[PDB]
Each structure stands twice: as C-alpha cells, then as structure tokens.
Amino acid sequence: APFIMPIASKYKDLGTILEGKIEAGSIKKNSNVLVMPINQTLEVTAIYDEADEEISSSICGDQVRLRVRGDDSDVQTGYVLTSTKNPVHATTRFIAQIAILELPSILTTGYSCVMHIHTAVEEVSFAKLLHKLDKTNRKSKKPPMFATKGMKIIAELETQTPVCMERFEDYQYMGRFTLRDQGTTVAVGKVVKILD
C-alpha cells in the first residue's frame, strides 16, 4: 500500500493547491509526497475535504485538495502524488491488451494517437503488435500484420514522455486507459507490463 493520487487540478493562491482523488493509500498532514514522474519532492501542509474543511488525514477514495510546499513549477495536471517509499511506476514503454472499437480503417505499428490513462492525457504510438486474441482470449502465435475494428490484440506502446501507470492486475484504475484518434474513441485497453 503506497500513496497514489493523480493530480487532477493545480492552481496557485497564496500557496499552491494540487487537487485529486486518492486512489490508494493514505496521506497525513505534514507528510512528504513525491511528484511522479518528475521525481519532485513536496511537503503536504494541509488536506481539505469536499466540505472545504481541513482534515488531519485522508484515506483513499477521498476527494481532496492538498496545499503543498516546495518547488512545483514543473508539476502539471496528470502527474501523480505518491509516497517516497514505493513511488507509483512511470515509463515510456509498456505492453497492454487492447480492444479495438470504432477504428475506421486499419491499425499498424506506426499508429499514433491520444491516450487518457487516468487524470493524465498523453500522446501514444504503437511500437509492435505482439499477438491477436480470439474468443477465449487466446494468444495467437503469429504477430498480427495489422489490426481491425472489434478485434482483441496485445501490443507494445511508446510515449514521448514518461507517464505514471500500473498493471491493471495491480491497480485497476491506474491500468485502464482509452485511446482516441481524437475524432473519437478508437479503443480501450489495460496495461499488462511496465517496461522499466
């Protein structure tokens, strides 16, 4: 149980206010959180719940506003607050099951698009298609030359810059993501392995 809170909003106002929803772990007043992936360290000097009232600590499933202390000029909506002991993972390469939905032509390696994992939104492109899947989610032993509508498949994905994520097998929310050829939603999918 590490702390995990994807920063949904950030604004100044006699002090910085990062706000999000704790997805795992808890946070106490006067603790040190880590901003991933930038590995910035910040101090948490106040928690405010939805009632706008201060609290000494928030468990997960809480919708909180955190007042933080320290350099944050680099902290952006989409990053994640996490514990400095087991910081949430972040990477630019990962493998993931992907159900293709409305995807109006084909889908092959070079395919690039927008991925929304959690509070984050990021440019992603396919690196390699590894297998196809049929009914009883089986692992086609020849890698697909291409992919098509309504087709399960498992590929490798690359991002320009690191984004925090977790195996769907470990934290469902940190593992789901939908893909958008931002006309529309071309696919959904879940991360199956973080590649360092």
Binding site: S105, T108, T109, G110, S125, F146, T148
Partner: protein, 261 residues
C-alpha cells in the same frame, strides 16, 4: 499535380540542404532573376558589387567575397537569355567535415519565379525566395496511403512494403504505384543500405533520388509522402517508409528463407 509535385519534391530537398550548410564571413551569393529580364543587367551589377566588395579590410573575408562574386558572374555569363521564365544561382564555399571547405555553385531554371528578383551576399543561403515554388497536398497523401492500406485490410496480395521487396517488384514485372518517404534514409550503391555503413566493410545515389529519375522506365507512377499525417507515420515507422500497391500478387523471390540450403 502529377509530375509537378515530383519536382516540388526536389526543390524541397534543395532548400533543405542549402539552409543546412553555413559559411563564414558574408560570402554566400544568392541570386534570383525573374523572366523577361536581360542577363547583362545582373552581370555588370555583380561587377559593381565587385568594386564595392573591394572595400572590406578583412583580407581573409574580402578575398572570399571577391572570388564568390567572380564565381557567380562568369557562371551567369554562361547563359544567353534568362531561360524560359526563371534563373536561380546559389554560390560560395561552405564549411565541411574534416575542416576542408568546398566551393559550391548551383544554377538552375525552376518553374516561373514570377517577379522575384533578388541579389544577396550574406553568410548563408536565402531560400525564402524558393519557398514560392512550393491540406489538398496532405489529403491526397493520406488518400494514397489509405488506398495502400486497403490492400492489407483486404489481404489481396497486391502490395509491398519493404526495400528489397518493393525494388524487386518494381524491377520484376510491374508495380502500380510506388510509395516513397520524402526523407527516406536509403543509399543505392546493387546493394541497398541506410546509415548502417560506419560499421560494415562493404553509382552511389540516394534510393529516393534514383527512383525520382527512373521510375518512369517501369510503369509507375511514383508518389513521395511525408510523415506529417497519421498515415504517413504509420507508412514510415511501420512499413519502412517504402512500398507499393501492385497488380498482381507476386511471390517475392531473390531472396531469403524459405532457404533452405
């Protein structure tokens, strides 16, 4: 549009290498003469610039400008009329690897550089002028690559995709349309390679350029596509950036596994 864009292609390659190279001390002659003009006007203009340039005090730089203005002038002299609408000349010596320069002098007839007259002597080449010889362009590009993708979404068996394969398909019988990536990183010595040459211990053209000059002798039909579009990026990072929509299934022979030996 057809064999027109194929030329715009080359202009784009040129502008790309001119602004890429840089020389020291204002010594890069750029000269653009629109149609209707007489050569003699610009000729004995450089002549004046030669006198003017003679007041520089920078022996190393002066001498440079002198030999550049000269190098331009008597190149310009080679022409008897500003050829059917247009004349462009880039001249000067540009720094090089190994610390040995290389005097450079290009002169060519474009496609109607309307009204664009220009002389400039800077420390770089001025290609802004050329820019006029350059998403209707992207839609066609996207439309074309999709036409090619269909031959994969349908499995038909008309397509390739691959250097060794596309070249062979072109070489052999026929290909209908050749899709090539504008900035294709491929050199044609016949054995093809990329920039994987610093390791190997292997007339010597750029595949890109060789196709632009011989494609005609094969039936195609050649289209240069840029990795601007989503299609492009796919076509480049997914299919080596070089391919074709054939007409009709081949068996891609010569040569590798099947083996077996």
């Amino acid at each position: 549009t057809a064999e027109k864009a194929i030329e715009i292609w080359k202009i784009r390659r040129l502008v790309k290498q001119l602004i890429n190279c840089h020389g020291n001390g204002t010594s890069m002659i750029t000269l653009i003469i629109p149609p209707g003009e007489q050569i003699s006007r610009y000729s004995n203009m450089l002549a004046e610039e030669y006198g003017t340039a003679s007041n520089i005090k920078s022996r190393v730089n002066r001498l440079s400008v002198l030999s550049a203005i000269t190098s331009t002038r008597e190149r310009l002299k080679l022409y008897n009329k500003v050829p059917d609408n247009g004349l462009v000349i880039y001249c000067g010596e540009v720094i090089m690897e190994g610390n040995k320069t290389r005097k450079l002098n290009i002169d060519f007839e474009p496609f109607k550089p309307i009204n664009t007259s220009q002389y400039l002597c800077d420390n770089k080449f001025h290609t802004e002028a050329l820019a006029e010889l350059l998403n209707v362009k992207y839609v066609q590009e996207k439309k074309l690559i999709q036409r090619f993708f269909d031959e994969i979404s349908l499995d038909s068996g008309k397509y390739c995709f691959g250097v060794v394969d596309t070249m062979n398909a072109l070489q052999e019988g026929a290909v209908e349309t050749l899709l090539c990536f504008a900035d294709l990183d491929m050199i044609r010595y016949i054995t093809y390679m990329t920039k994987e040459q610093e390791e190997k211990d292997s007339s010597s053209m750029l595949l890109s350029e060789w196709l632009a000059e011989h494609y005609k002798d094969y039936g195609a039909n050649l289209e240069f596509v840029s990795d601007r579009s989503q299609e492009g990026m796919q076509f480049v990072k997914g299919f080596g950036g070089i391919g074709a929509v054939m007409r009709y299934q081949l068996d891609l022979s010569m040569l590798d596994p099947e083996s077996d030996e």
